[PDB]
Design an enzyme around this catalytic site. Structure first.
Site, PDB file in Angstrom:
ATOM      1  N   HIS A 132     -40.789  -4.237 -37.287  1.00 52.92           N
ATOM      2  CA  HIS A 132     -41.613  -3.362 -38.107  1.00 52.92           C
ATOM      3  C   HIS A 132     -41.116  -3.759 -39.432  1.00 52.92           C
ATOM      4  O   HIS A 132     -40.028  -4.081 -39.605  1.00 52.92           O
ATOM      5  CB  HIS A 132     -41.080  -1.875 -37.869  1.00 52.92           C
ATOM      6  CG  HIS A 132     -42.140  -1.053 -37.163  1.00 52.92           C
ATOM      7  ND1 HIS A 132     -42.839   0.113 -37.519  1.00 52.92           N
ATOM      8  CD2 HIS A 132     -42.657  -1.323 -35.928  1.00 52.92           C
ATOM      9  CE1 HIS A 132     -43.524   0.530 -36.835  1.00 52.92           C
ATOM     10  NE2 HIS A 132     -43.457  -0.228 -35.582  1.00 52.92           N
ATOM     11  N   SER A 156     -46.618  -8.507 -36.872  1.00 59.04           N
ATOM     12  CA  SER A 156     -46.598  -9.837 -36.028  1.00 59.04           C
ATOM     13  C   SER A 156     -47.253 -10.907 -36.827  1.00 59.04           C
ATOM     14  O   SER A 156     -47.327 -10.983 -38.085  1.00 59.04           O
ATOM     15  CB  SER A 156     -47.484  -9.254 -34.777  1.00 59.04           C
ATOM     16  OG  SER A 156     -47.237 -10.243 -33.758  1.00 59.04           O
ATOM     17  N   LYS A 162     -54.976  -4.640 -22.654  1.00 61.54           N
ATOM     18  CA  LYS A 162     -54.806  -6.112 -22.456  1.00 61.54           C
ATOM     19  C   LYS A 162     -53.528  -6.270 -21.627  1.00 61.54           C
ATOM     20  O   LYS A 162     -53.196  -6.961 -20.789  1.00 61.54           O
ATOM     21  CB  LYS A 162     -54.781  -7.018 -23.746  1.00 61.54           C
ATOM     22  CG  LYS A 162     -55.725  -8.382 -23.210  1.00 61.54           C
ATOM     23  CD  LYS A 162     -55.812  -9.110 -24.799  1.00 61.54           C
ATOM     24  CE  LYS A 162     -55.403 -10.459 -24.341  1.00 61.54           C
ATOM     25  NZ  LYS A 162     -56.048 -11.444 -25.519  1.00 61.54           N
ATOM     26  N   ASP A 163     -52.451  -5.624 -22.287  1.00 63.91           N
ATOM     27  CA  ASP A 163     -51.352  -5.591 -21.589  1.00 63.91           C
ATOM     28  C   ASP A 163     -51.036  -4.800 -20.179  1.00 63.91           C
ATOM     29  O   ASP A 163     -50.630  -5.481 -19.454  1.00 63.91           O
ATOM     30  CB  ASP A 163     -50.297  -4.940 -22.813  1.00 63.91           C
ATOM     31  CG  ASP A 163     -49.449  -5.949 -23.344  1.00 63.91           C
ATOM     32  OD1 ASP A 163     -48.809  -6.598 -22.703  1.00 63.91           O
ATOM     33  OD2 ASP A 163     -49.434  -5.871 -24.496  1.00 63.91           O
ATOM     34  N   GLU A 212     -27.665 -22.067  -8.269  1.00 60.54           N
ATOM     35  CA  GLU A 212     -29.399 -22.132  -8.416  1.00 60.54           C
ATOM     36  C   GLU A 212     -29.980 -22.812  -9.388  1.00 60.54           C
ATOM     37  O   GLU A 212     -29.096 -23.562 -10.328  1.00 60.54           O
ATOM     38  CB  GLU A 212     -29.659 -20.419  -8.374  1.00 60.54           C
ATOM     39  CG  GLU A 212     -29.409 -19.946  -9.916  1.00 60.54           C
ATOM     40  CD  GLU A 212     -27.908 -19.238  -9.852  1.00 60.54           C
ATOM     41  OE1 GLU A 212     -26.945 -19.768  -9.121  1.00 60.54           O
ATOM     42  OE2 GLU A 212     -27.826 -18.451 -10.598  1.00 60.54           O
TER      43      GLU A 212
HETATM   44  C1  HEM Z   1     -33.573  -9.452 -23.215  1.00 65.41           C
HETATM   45  C2  HEM Z   1     -34.114 -10.655 -24.124  1.00 65.41           C
HETATM   46  C3  HEM Z   1     -35.360 -10.500 -24.861  1.00 65.41           C
HETATM   47  C4  HEM Z   1     -36.215  -9.392 -25.122  1.00 65.41           C
HETATM   48  C5  HEM Z   1     -36.296  -8.065 -23.984  1.00 65.41           C
HETATM   49  C6  HEM Z   1     -37.253  -9.791 -26.080  1.00 65.41           C
HETATM   50  C7  HEM Z   1     -38.351  -8.942 -26.414  1.00 65.41           C
HETATM   51  C8  HEM Z   1     -38.988  -9.372 -27.598  1.00 65.41           C
HETATM   52  C9  HEM Z   1     -40.344  -8.740 -27.855  1.00 65.41           C
HETATM   53  C10 HEM Z   1     -40.558  -7.346 -27.053  1.00 65.41           C
HETATM   54  C11 HEM Z   1     -40.861  -9.150 -28.751  1.00 65.41           C
HETATM   55  C12 HEM Z   1     -42.159  -8.451 -29.653  1.00 65.41           C
HETATM   56  C13 HEM Z   1     -43.238  -8.606 -28.915  1.00 65.41           C
HETATM   57  C14 HEM Z   1     -43.744  -9.873 -28.806  1.00 65.41           C
HETATM   58  O1  HEM Z   1     -43.752 -10.659 -29.807  1.00 65.41           O
HETATM   59  O2  HEM Z   1     -44.679 -10.277 -27.888  1.00 65.41           O
HETATM   60  C15 HEM Z   1     -39.976 -10.090 -29.214  1.00 65.41           C
HETATM   61  C16 HEM Z   1     -40.453 -11.065 -30.063  1.00 65.41           C
HETATM   62  C17 HEM Z   1     -39.696 -12.257 -30.774  1.00 65.41           C
HETATM   63  N1  HEM Z   1     -38.296 -12.830 -29.873  1.00 65.41           N
HETATM   64 FE1  HEM Z   1     -37.423 -11.660 -28.370  1.00 65.41          FE
HETATM   65  N2  HEM Z   1     -36.678 -10.913 -26.428  1.00 65.41           N
HETATM   66  C18 HEM Z   1     -35.762 -11.488 -25.860  1.00 65.41           C
HETATM   67  C19 HEM Z   1     -35.037 -12.482 -26.110  1.00 65.41           C
HETATM   68  C20 HEM Z   1     -35.239 -13.310 -27.316  1.00 65.41           C
HETATM   69  C21 HEM Z   1     -34.668 -14.780 -27.384  1.00 65.41           C
HETATM   70  C22 HEM Z   1     -33.454 -15.189 -26.592  1.00 65.41           C
HETATM   71  C23 HEM Z   1     -34.914 -15.183 -28.627  1.00 65.41           C
HETATM   72  C24 HEM Z   1     -34.810 -16.598 -28.972  1.00 65.41           C
HETATM   73  C25 HEM Z   1     -34.739 -16.648 -30.310  1.00 65.41           C
HETATM   74  C26 HEM Z   1     -35.904 -14.119 -29.029  1.00 65.41           C
HETATM   75  C27 HEM Z   1     -36.716 -14.248 -30.094  1.00 65.41           C
HETATM   76  C28 HEM Z   1     -37.770 -13.648 -30.312  1.00 65.41           C
HETATM   77  C29 HEM Z   1     -38.848 -13.993 -31.856  1.00 65.41           C
HETATM   78  C30 HEM Z   1     -38.847 -15.073 -32.844  1.00 65.41           C
HETATM   79  C31 HEM Z   1     -39.478 -12.991 -31.620  1.00 65.41           C
HETATM   80  C32 HEM Z   1     -40.782 -13.033 -32.578  1.00 65.41           C
HETATM   81  C33 HEM Z   1     -42.215 -12.910 -32.137  1.00 65.41           C
HETATM   82  C34 HEM Z   1     -43.126 -13.304 -32.899  1.00 65.41           C
HETATM   83  O3  HEM Z   1     -43.643 -14.499 -33.262  1.00 65.41           O
HETATM   84  O4  HEM Z   1     -43.944 -12.086 -33.430  1.00 65.41           O
HETATM   85  N3  HEM Z   1     -35.875 -13.094 -28.174  1.00 65.41           N
HETATM   86  N4  HEM Z   1     -39.152 -10.577 -28.438  1.00 65.41           N
END
Ligand code: HEM
Ligand SMILES: CCCCCCCCCCCCCCCCCC(=O)OC[C@H](COP(=O)([O-])OCC(O)COP(=O)([O-])OC[C@@H](COC(=O)CCCCCCCCCCCCCCCCC)OC(=O)CCCCCCCCCCCCCCCCC)OC(=O)CCCCCCCCCCCCCCCCC
Ligand SMILES: CCCCCCCC/C=C\CCCCCCCC(=O)OC[C@H](COP(=O)(O)OCCN)OC(=O)CCCCCCC/C=C\CCCCCCCC
Ligand code: HEC
Ligand code: HEM
Lengths: 378, 239, 79, 64, 55
Positions: free
Chosen positions: A200, A204, A226-227, A270
């Site tokens: 927020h 996006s 869509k989701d 694994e």
């Molecule tokens: C339990 C682990 C994780 C969860 C539940 C998670 C979940 C999410 C969610 C819900 C979003 C926003 C929805 C979306 O963009 O589709 C997001 C965005 C993002 N996440 Fe994660 N993520 C996880 C791990 C990671 C990891 C390991 C990285 C490594 C860099 C990361 C980097 C990002 C980035 C850069 C975005 C931005 C998306 C955009 O371009 O708008 N996340 N993540």
């Protein structure tokens, strides 16, 4: 008046899901991250109906799972959903990450850095509790990983025995590894609740790389449906794998009850670690070797400030698109190497991947982003 | 630094996706196990209650356990006394303990056949091959006195004195007992013992596809409605 | 504080649209799905394949060579 | 008894006969000496593969 | 098996009967109370037992 905007609880959810400006071109790839959320609620839920029954008795542990996958109603279903529903939570990760190295998604410094921490925590819980089905693969990988951290010159002697509760696996170890599984999980959920607070206040992205505040549509009726549609499509593949061919993704060596009297012949974990285990044994010098193993999850925080282009995303950069597909093929050859005995070319060849995972994104990608800056005059 | 003999494949009667188990082969394999081979392994996890829904009827099943009488537990005025036996009890162990087992059979433990099938690279096919293709040893190869030549073993030799051949048993159902048929019935019994949820699995795996495969084509349509507001707009410019 | 009232400024533009209930949602799906894929696969079939193509060669080379020096050692195990 | 018959019938193919000639040639080699490195470890496997490939198909049909 | 061992540091206070059900046989059907918590399981305490003995 309008109850949706004056109640203390519904302001929070209207501003968060129902009514937030969203772009309109988003690729499906913006889809997957939500799926991970579905996985998160299912690993927790299915995983408490096992700690209900399991017994941290070093000569009672293995027969425990053996009676659960026979004795009780529907336990054969739940055991396998828990063993297979994390072969796919690890599927999700490699897609949600690789995309952010396509659509310039790291310029979110705050969002990006509270990521890598989660990567480390999730990657460690699975090892920390795949050694307590209490089988030979579980003990004989525990011993091997344990003996490395003990090669620190002054660190090693003392730390190693605190986790064993003695000299070797006994009642004093299985108990505190089963201590570990319970708590890494709850802590992880709170780091995911904070990942989004950052989200927020920047909104996006969009798969072109140009700010579009001009045309933002809501996130009700569109992103909500869509989701839901794609989500009820993950439950086709998960269930087909589990209830048709479960034994496919495992190994037939957590069936002989644990013994110190045997030793497995071709030990290998694994699939989804053999990558950060093929660097390890690729090189001599044990103290050094442990360091090159973690050079990787920290290679990543070093890559927002090596950016050297003028535009965002690879869509308009047709010459860099070549180098991004020699990264994934590198990570595929490097996983074919690992789970396999040592022969003549395996050492020479696995070596190249180790040399290259670093020469691609350390030298090449910041020096080949100027050769094309010079061509459009920026 | 040697070779190995990977077992072939056979058109097993249960090999399909939507197939079942021949519930007459397992019944006949149980007697083979009991009379012929039931001495060297434990079969601990399989009680006497697990065959009534598979192989035998209950009043036909209780009389099997009665024949083998076993020691019972301590109690008052006759602790560790003999007793006929009941349905629940597990399959009686042949041997006292690891040391006697080692002593009687060349210091090598005999594996207990409860997970012997799932824990072999291969499976029912490898098990069927290992119990048929024995051969005399080649020329110029040394062997132990207690060791017998077998080409399906990683060591190429194992302490298994051949226990299976023609007309060692008698099939009560009226079957000409050939080595191949008895081995086949044994293998079909053993896999079922290693994983009994086969038959209850491939049915929910079928009432999942039919139900889903018609609800999911609905959600798509409701989708299209909603996104069909926005694919019909024209966008002109007038400065 | 960045809701639907205050964002970018734009001027002199116009857009049109119908409802969903006055239209059908399948305008020649069969006769327009195929040409799009035909025109787009060509462009990026060349941009995902060749990087991946040099792994088949090395994998087959190593597999067959190791198979030789495992199944045919007695060739050079000269008596 | 069916299995011995079908093994006999499946021996007569080119694979099995060319494997048996190789095996007996190697045994001719080995029998002349005593310190030689050669057992029948390799050609015997070729013989077994050549048999089993064809045996595995029609065997189960000949059952009752 | 079922042979006799001299005993070492680990071993517990040897229990008299094969099972507690032998107690009703010889002691008139009156099972003797165990003596691990007899202090805490009584109103009185360590002065109820003493006043029992001389009474
Ligand atoms: C339990 C682990 C994780 C969860 C539940 C998670 C979940 C999410 C969610 C819900 C979003 C926003 C929805 C979306 O963009 O589709 C997001 C965005 C993002 N996440 Fe994660 N993520 C996880 C791990 C990671 C990891 C390991 C990285 C490594 C860099 C990361 C980097 C990002 C980035 C850069 C975005 C931005 C998306 C955009 O371009 O708008 N996340 N993540
Ligand atoms: C859960 C388990 C996870 C695993 C899921 C797999 C990936 C699913 C996914 O998210 O992909 C979305 C994506 C949905 O397509 P989209 O919403 O239109 O745009 C997303 C693309 O990123 C946007 O791509 P695009 O539309 O711009 O076009 C790219 C693509 C062409 O992409 C497409 O147009 C796919 C849709 C064509 C209709 C297919 C009808 C059935 C045939 O062509 C290529 O560059 C691929 C190289 C040549 C392959 C030709 C095969 C095309 C068929 O699915 C595909 O792209 C299908 C092809 C990818 C499969 C690769 C597997 C290889 C093995
Ligand atoms: C590794 C072990 C895990 C196995 C998972 C299997 C991963 C396979 C991913 C499948 C993707 C390959 C087919 C994709 C279809 C396709 O090519 O679509 C083309 C499409 C065209 O997009 P446009 O926006 O239109 O660009 C303009 C084009 N003129 O290209 C893309 O979308 C590329 C998207 C990139 C996703 C990357 C997938 C994962 C690759 C990871 C690389 C290495 C990551 C390293 C991280 C290691 C630590 C986790
Ligand atoms: C002559 C007594 C005897 C008989 C009868 C017998 N077994 Fe065995 N078996 C043994 C012994 C002893 C071993 C252990 C061999 C070793 O480890 O050296 C063994 C091992 C095995 C193995 C090898 C397991 C492995 O890891 O390779 C298999 C398979 C086996 N038995 C199957 C059977 C079956 C099935 C039967 C019933 C048809 C049977 N045997 C009858 C004594 C016997
Ligand atoms: C990110 C979340 C989690 C992951 C990735 C994870 C992963 C795993 C894995 C891979 C196993 C191996 C099971 C097997 O091989 O049979 C396992 C076992 C187990 N986990 Fe989890 N786990 C998670 C959360 C939890 C939680 C939250 C609990 C309890 C609160 C828990 C309790 C257990 C228990 C008791 C076992 C042993 C039971 C058995 O082996 O059948 N896990 N876990």
């Amino acid at each position: 008046t309008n109850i949706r905007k004056s109640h203390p609880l519904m302001k929070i959810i209207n501003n968060a899901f129902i009514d937030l400006p969203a772009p309109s071109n988003i690729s499906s790839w913006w889809n997957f991250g939500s799926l991970l959320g579905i996985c998160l609620i299912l690993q927790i839920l299915t995983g408490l109906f096992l700690a209900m029954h399991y017994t941290s008795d070093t000569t009672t542990a293995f027969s425990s799972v053996t009676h659960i996958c026979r004795d009780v109603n529907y336990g054969w279903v739940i055991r396998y959903l828990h063993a297979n529903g994390a072969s796919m939570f690890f599927i999700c990760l490699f897609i949600h990450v690789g995309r952010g190295l396509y659509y310039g998604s790291y310029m979110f410094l705050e969002t990006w850095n509270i990521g890598v921490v989660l990567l480390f925590t999730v990657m460690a819980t699975a090892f920390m509790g795949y050694v307590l089905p209490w089988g030979q693969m579980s003990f004989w990988g525990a011993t091997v990983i344990t003996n490395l951290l003990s090669a620190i010159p002054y660190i090693g002697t003392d730390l190693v025995e605190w986790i064993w509760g003695g000299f070797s696996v006994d009642k004093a170890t299985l108990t505190r590894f089963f201590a570990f599984h319970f708590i890494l999980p709850f802590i992880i959920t709170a780091l995911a609740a904070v990942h989004l607070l950052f989200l927020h206040e920047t909104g996006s992205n969009n798969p072109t790389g140009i700010s579009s505040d001009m045309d933002k549509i809501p996130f009700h009726p569109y992103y909500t449906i869509k989701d839901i549609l794609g989500a009820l499509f993950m439950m086709l593949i998960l269930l087909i794998l589990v209830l048709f061919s479960p034994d496919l993704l495992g190994d037939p060596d957590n069936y002989t009850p644990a013994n110190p009297l045997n030793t497995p012949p071709h030990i290998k974990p694994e699939w989804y670690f053999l990558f950060a285990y093929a660097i390890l044994r690729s090189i001599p010098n044990k103290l050094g070797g442990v360091l090159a193993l973690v050079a990787s999850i920290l290679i990543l925080i070093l890559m927002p400030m090596l950016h050297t282009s003028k535009q965002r995303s690879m869509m308009f950069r047709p010459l860099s698109q070549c180098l991004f597909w020699m990264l994934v093929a590198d990570l595929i050859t490097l996983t074919w190497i690992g789970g396999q005995p040592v022969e003549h070319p395996f050492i020479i060849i696995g070596q190249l991947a180790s040399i290259l995972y670093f020469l691609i994104i350390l030298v090449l990608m910041p020096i080949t982003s100027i050769i094309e800056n010079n061509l459009l005059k920026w | 630094t040697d070779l190995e003999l990977h077992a072939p494949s056979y058109p097993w009667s249960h090999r399909g996706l939507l197939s079942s188990l021949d519930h007459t082969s397992i019944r006949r394999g149980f007697q083979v196990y009991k009379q012929v081979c039931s001495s060297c392994h434990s079969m601990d996890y399989v009680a006497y209650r697990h065959l009534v829904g598979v192989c035998y009827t209950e009043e036909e099943a209780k009389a099997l356990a009665e024949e083998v009488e076993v020691q019972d537990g301590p109690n008052e005025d006759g602790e560790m006394f003999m007793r006929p036996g009941k349905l629940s009890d597990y399959f009686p162990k042949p041997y006292p303990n690891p040391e006697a087992a080692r002593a009687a059979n060349n210091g090598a433990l005999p594996p207990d056949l409860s997970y012997i099938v799932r824990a072999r690279h291969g499976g029912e096919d490898y098990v069927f091959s290992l119990l048929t293709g024995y051969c005399e040893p080649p020329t110029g190869v040394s062997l132990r006195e207690g060791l017998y030549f077998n080409p399906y073993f990683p060591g190429q030799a194992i302490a298994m004195a051949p226990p299976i051949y023609n007309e060692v048993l008698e099939f009560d159902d009226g079957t000409p007992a050939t080595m191949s048929q008895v081995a086949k019935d044994v293998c079909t019994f053993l896999r079922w013992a290693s994983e009994p949820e086969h038959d209850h699995r491939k049915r929910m795996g079928l009432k999942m596809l039919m139900m889903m495969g018609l609800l999911l084509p609905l959600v798509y349509a409701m989708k299209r409605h909603k996104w069909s507001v926005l694919k019909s707009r024209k966008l002109a410019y007038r400065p | 504080g960045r809701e639907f009232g205050h964002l970018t400024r734009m001027r002199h533009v116009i857009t049109y649209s119908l409802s969903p209930f006055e239209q059908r949602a399948f305008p020649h799906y069969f006769t327009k799905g195929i040409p799009n894929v035909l025109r787009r696969t060509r462009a990026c079939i060349l941009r995902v394949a060749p990087p991946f193509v040099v792994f088949y060669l090395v994998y087959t080379w190593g597999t067959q060579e190791f198979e030789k020096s495992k199944r045919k050692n007695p060739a050079a195990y000269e008596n | 008894d069916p299995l011995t018959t079908v093994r006999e019938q499946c021996e007569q193919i080119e694979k099995c006969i060319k494997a048996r000639e190789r095996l007996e040639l190697c045994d001719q080699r080995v029998s002349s000496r005593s310190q030689t490195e050669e057992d029948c470890t390799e050609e015997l496997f070729d013989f077994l593969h050549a048999r089993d490939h064809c045996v595995a198909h029609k065997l189960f049909n000949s059952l009752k």
